[model samples]
Target: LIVTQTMKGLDIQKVAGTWYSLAMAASDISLLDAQSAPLRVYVEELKPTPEGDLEILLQKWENGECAQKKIIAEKTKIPAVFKIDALNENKVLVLDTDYKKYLLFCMENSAEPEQSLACQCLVRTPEVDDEALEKFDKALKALPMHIRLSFNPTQLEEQCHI
Candidate 1:
C-alpha cells in the first residue's frame, strides 16, 4: 500500500525522536499539546522485535499533565518507513511507532509553547488526491449504497486506516 511518490526518504534509525502535532482536519489534533489540551505525545521507547516488527510505548499528555501512559500497540512495524507525510506546503504528518498518524504544522524553527500547532485526523492517511479521489468515487458508486460505509469522520478513520 506504499504510495511511491508519497514515500519519504529518511533513515529509520535516525527517525526516532520527539515530534509535535501541527494541524488536523477531522479529530482535534490539539490533544497532543501539553499547554492547551488533555493529551500529550511521547515515544518513551522503541525497539525491533525478532520477527521484524517494532515495539513502541507511547504516552499521552493531557491538561498540562500526562495520563493514559501505556504501550498502546506492539509488534507492528511499517513496511516502508518514511520521514514525514506532507499534507501541503505548510503541514507534515508523522506516523508514530504506535501506528497513530499525527498531523503537525508549525512555523519555521520554533518548538515551544506558542509556535507549534497540532491536530489529529481520524484517518491514518491523508485524503486522496484528485486522481485517487475520482477512482474512489467510482468504486463507491459501483457498490450498493447500502453496503458502503458512511463517509463521516469516524468511518473515514476506520476505512482509511485499513
Candidate 2:
C-alpha cells in the first residue's frame, strides 16, 4: 500500500452548510463509479450540533422525491478529523475547503493490518473547473484508490434542488 503525506485536515466548523455533490469516490458501496449506466444525483447537508458535533444529511433523488440519510459526526483526537456514527471506524478528514464554493472530504479506516480509504468533493454548484477536476482526479487515484465510486452529476439542477 502506498503511504501518502496527510495533514491533520482543515477546520471542521467551517464545513457547515448544504453542498451539492460535485463528485464522489467511495468503496464497497460504489457511490461514484463510472461504469454504472444510470444517472447518479445527490447533495450533502452538514451542520454543527449544539453540543459541537456534526449533523450530516445526505440527499438523493428517488421516484421524483428526495431521499435522505442522516449521521452524527463525533470529533476525534486529531484536528479536522471526525468519526461518523454511521460509518463505524471511519475517520472523516476535511482535506480542503473554502466554505463557499468547494470542499474536499477524505474518509478512511485502519486496523491491525489493513486499511480502506474513500473521498468526496462537495460544491455549491454542480459545475467543476478543469484545473480543479484534474486535481480531484489525481487525488482519487493516489488517495488509497477508492475500491468503489458512485454518481456523476451532469444535470443536477434538473434532478435535485441543490
Candidate 3:
C-alpha cells in the first residue's frame, strides 16, 4: 500500500554532510530500500520568524569547485503538506512543497548529476515515474520547467557541505 504525508508547514532543515532521500512513502518509512538515490543534504541553522519563515544558508559543492553561499528566506507558498499519489515496485509519486508534485524513481545507488538523462514536470496527479524520459503531462502545472531542473543534486551536494 501507499500513503501520503503532510509536512504540516514544518520547516525542513537538513544537517550539513548528511544525505537525505528526496522521496519515500509515508507508510514505508522503515523501507530504506526505496531511498537508494540519496542526495547529500545540508543546511545552516538559524532561527525562525514569528510567521514561520526560516532563513536558510546554503552552500553547494559542484564540478570540482565550491559555490558562493545562497540565502533562501521565504517558505513554500502552499500549506506545508506532501501527498503520495502513486506507487509501484521501484517508483513513487510524491506531492512535495504543496506546490508541485514530483516523481522519484528508485535507483540502485546514489546518482550523479551527469546521470540525469531526462527531466519532466509533475503538475498532475498521475505524475511521471521516470524522470529522464517523460515530458509534462498535467493540466494545473503552474511551476515552470526550468525551476524543476534547477535542483542539481551534484551542485546541491557541494553547496550543502559548505
Candidate 4:
C-alpha cells in the first residue's frame, strides 16, 4: 500500500477551531456512500490539552437530534501522528492543513477482519474555495486505496444548534 505524508512542523494550537465536513472517503464505500450514511461526522472543534494531546469535539446526527461527542487523540512520538481509540484503535495522521482554509486527515483503524482506512476533509466554511477543494481531491487520489464514494454532510451538520 502507498504511504501518505503527514504535515511537517504542524502547529496544533493553530488548528483548533470549528470546522465543517467537506468530504470523506473510506475503503468500504458503504462507510460514506449514501447521503444519510452512518459514519458522517461533523467536527465542531479541536481542543489542545496540556499534555500536548488533542481533544476532538465532534457533532453527529443521533437518533433524532444532533448529539455531541468527544474523543481524545493522544500524541505519538511522531509530531503529527496521534493515537485515537474511538470505534477501534486508530492512528490518526494530519495529512495536510493550511490552518486557515482547509484541513485533511486520515485515520487507519485496526478493525476486526480487516483494516479500514478513512480520510476526511474539513473546511472553515461549508462553501470552500476551489483551491482547497482541489487539494482535497488530489490528496484522496494519492492514497493507495480507491475513493469509491464521497459525500458532503453540510446540510445535515447545519441542523445542529448550540
Model 1, stretches more than 4 Å misplaced? 1-39, 62-65, 72-78, 81-162
In candidate 1, what are the lDDT values of residues 73-111, reduced to their tens digit?
222144433122133222222332233433221111123
Number of the top-ranking candidate, with TM-score as the measure: 4
How far in Å is the alpha carbon of 51 misplaced in model 1? Answer: 1.2
Each model's C-alpha lDDT?
0.30, 0.59, 0.28, 0.72
**Better candidate by TM-score, 1 or 3:** 1
Pick by lDDT: 2 or 4, better one: 4
Model 4: per-residue Cα lDDT over 1-162, one tens digit each: 533678999899898888776766777666655544555566778888878898999876667667777889999989898998755677788989999889888777655213467777878776745676778778777765545433344452464422
Q: Global lDDT for candidate 4?
A: 0.72
Q: Give me the overall lDDT of model 1.
A: 0.30
lDDT of 2 by residue, 46-114 (tens): 887766677787665555566665667787676667786533475667766767787767666655213
RMSD of each: 16.1, 4.7, 15.6, 3.3
Q: Sort the predicted structures by TM-score, highest score first.
A: 4, 2, 1, 3
The worst-scoring run of ten residues by lDDT in candidate 1 lies at: 102-111
Q: Which residues of candidate 3, in runs, are more than 4 Å off?
A: 1-3, 9-41, 76-162
Worst 10 residues of 3 by lDDT: 25-34
**How far off is residue 61 in model 3, in Å?**
1.0
